[PDB]
Amino acid sequence: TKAYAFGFPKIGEKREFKKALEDFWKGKITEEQFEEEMNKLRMYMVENYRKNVDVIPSNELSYYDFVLDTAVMVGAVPERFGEYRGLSTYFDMARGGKALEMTKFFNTNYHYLVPEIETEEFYLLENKPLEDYLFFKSKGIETAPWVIGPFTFLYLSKRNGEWIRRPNQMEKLLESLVSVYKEVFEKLVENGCKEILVNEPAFVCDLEKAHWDLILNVYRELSEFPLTVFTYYDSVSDYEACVSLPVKRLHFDFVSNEENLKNLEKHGFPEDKKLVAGVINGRQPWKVDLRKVASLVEKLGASAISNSCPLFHLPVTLELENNLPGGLKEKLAFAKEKLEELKMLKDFLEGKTFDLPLQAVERVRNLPEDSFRREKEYTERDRIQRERLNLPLFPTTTIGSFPQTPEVRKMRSKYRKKEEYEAFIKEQIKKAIELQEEIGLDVLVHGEFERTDMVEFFAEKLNGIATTQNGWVLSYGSRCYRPPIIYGTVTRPEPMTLKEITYAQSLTEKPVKGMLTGPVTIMSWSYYREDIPEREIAYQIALAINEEVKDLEEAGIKIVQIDEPAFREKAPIKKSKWPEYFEWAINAFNLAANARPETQIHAHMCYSDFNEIIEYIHQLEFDVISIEASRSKGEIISAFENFKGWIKQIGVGVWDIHSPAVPSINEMREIVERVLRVLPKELIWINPDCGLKTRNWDEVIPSLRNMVALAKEMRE
Ligand SMILES: [Zn+2]
């Protein structure tokens, strides 16, 4: 049994990767020092592989992003960066002022950099696969370079501001592209490379027959090389076309979906090649019953095994996590432990090893069918809310978070590392409330000074959810986070945000909004049990959140905001599966947002465009939705304008909070004036695009004053 693994985390057990990057960016260390740090990580990674599997990947230590690495390999460096000068340029492309766009890698919380294709001509600018292959080879360690395949690379790239995903857009680029892959592979083989790991996750996307025609041509041109093709994150819809590819080894993800297995049972698997069975989950941290896995492997008739999808979605190691809820650690397995499972699975399959390792649940299961809608419909709630709030036309507000002083950051760190902290928080809130009132904002926020991030803050306060000490996972570049683990029934023992919001409201006559995170978002940034349906977990969390809403309502809070960024982001990769997904995502949100008619519910959505989801948005029980309209100068409004029967209020983001610039009153006006083209003025709120936690006070205060001034003008 041939054992593969891929995507082992690169960050190191002590996050040496993060420290190396930031120490280089801040100049604390030289480039030669940086490369020495990197070389340590390389060896650490392969040593983990060497101890556990048969095929050892190289070219996996990307200094920022592997898609960016691919772009550089094929010479796709945009004109604005000029001559490619190595690391300096690389990091300018990744994190510079004019950096490439960053976006989510398929349906995961990893973010890659979007290549920009300016020329139709690709060339070999740098051969990192050969470089890394020789690095390990010189040490007497044979490795298989890990590369992003030509189709997927193009599929993840943009040209002229748009994806390159229509078959008629890809053809010519593919021809030039493949030529560069041919050169790279030839160099590898000429140097004695025996196997190359080609990643083609885009094969699991909604493709047409014409895509597969192009893909067929690409791999015909590469059929002389020893390639193993990997696919993951979902099933490959056109199974027959996929197993027809002229490659000798093909990997499928048999964990994230049922269709791969079903299709394999139907059409069988070509004798002309070998199956690599991706059967150990790369995305969840649960130890599996290896006897069950072994049986699956036999049913598949596979002679090779591996993880289903990249291991870098897991933390490095469980070893030192010794303050987890009793009995939990024994059910877990992080990246290192996943390699060990593969080794054990191989050992078992080869015969070398014989020993292998309600009250709230009822509420959910028995939810009345009426629980998923609010008491009164929008039109009637609206009159009640407006009468209660007495807001002016074009009310102004903000999205929730405020700038964090070094003091605020340090204090929060100290506390995490109670009475003194609370006092400090109450102090910053008073200041923020007074500042907002002085500026003349209509609806206020408490600023979220007490929160690290919108998921961890709540995860830490919910039963059934654990948080780790060192379970770091790379989000992008040098930024890591620790995903919570939803290990049991989720409930909310005590109020989570009452203290802060209540105090805040007691300082002003103006409405102060409650500030919560939705259920799907909490799930999306966490690990969770697989023996229970996603929807039931979401509902549990949603009911817990609704507990907070009621408590907020009881304390007299008139407005509650529920941020659900994962609404679209957790949608399946396959469009055909959307309706079933949104059915429960909608239900989950509505359970959380089940508020009295008198309570105005706000929902913030970060999406750059709502055209594909407007139909699902229309089913949510919010009263106000805030959108980020600045970057499109208001054109994002099109989806709402063209939705016959849109009657809900819209919070128009008129200010790009990812920039230090203070927008002029006219710059904001352009946006507000655009949204007012069709929609009635009574629906329009004015706010920033998003939270202000990344901004500085010096730029926020002037921007807010301009926002208020604009509202005043607009009313007149
Ligand atoms: Zn946002």
UniProtKB/Swiss-Prot annotation:
GO MF: 5-methyltetrahydropteroyltriglutamate-homocysteine S-methyltransferase activity; zinc ion binding
Pathway: Amino-acid biosynthesis; L-methionine biosynthesis via de novo pathway; L-methionine from L-homocysteine (MetE route): step 1/1
Listed Gene3D superfamilies: 3.20.20.210
Reported cofactor(s): Zn(2+)
Annotated EC: 2.1.1.14
Amino-acid positions noted as binding L-homocysteine in the UniProt annotation, renumbered to this chain: I399, G400, S401, E448, D563
Entry keywords, A to Z: Amino-acid biosynthesis, Metal-binding, Methionine biosynthesis, Methyltransferase, Repeat, Transferase, Zinc
Catalytic activity: 5-methyltetrahydropteroyltri-L-glutamate + L-homocysteine = tetrahydropteroyltri-L-glutamate + L-methionine
Active site residues per record: H658
GO biological process: 'de novo' L-methionine biosynthetic process; methylation
SUPFAM superfamilies in the cross-refs: UROD/MetE-like (SSF51726)
Protein residues bound to Zn(2+): H604, C606, E628, C690
Listed InterPro entries: Cbl-indep_Met_Synth_N, Cobalamin-indep_Met_synthase, Met_Synth_C/arc, UROD/MetE-like_sf
Ligand binding (5-methyltetrahydropteroyltri-L-glutamate): R15, E16, F17, K18, K104, R479, C480, W525, E569
Sequence positions that bind L-methionine: I399, G400, S401, E448, D563
Cofactor remark from the record: Binds 1 zinc ion per subunit.
Enzyme class: transferase
Xref: PANTHER family: 5-METHYLTETRAHYDROPTEROYLTRIGLUTAMATE--HOMOCYSTEINE METHYLTRANSFERASE
Family the entry assigns: Belongs to the vitamin-B12 independent methionine synthase family.
Function per UniProt: Catalyzes the transfer of a methyl group from 5-methyltetrahydrofolate to homocysteine resulting in methionine formation.
Protein name in UniProt: 5-methyltetrahydropteroyltriglutamate--homocysteine methyltransferase
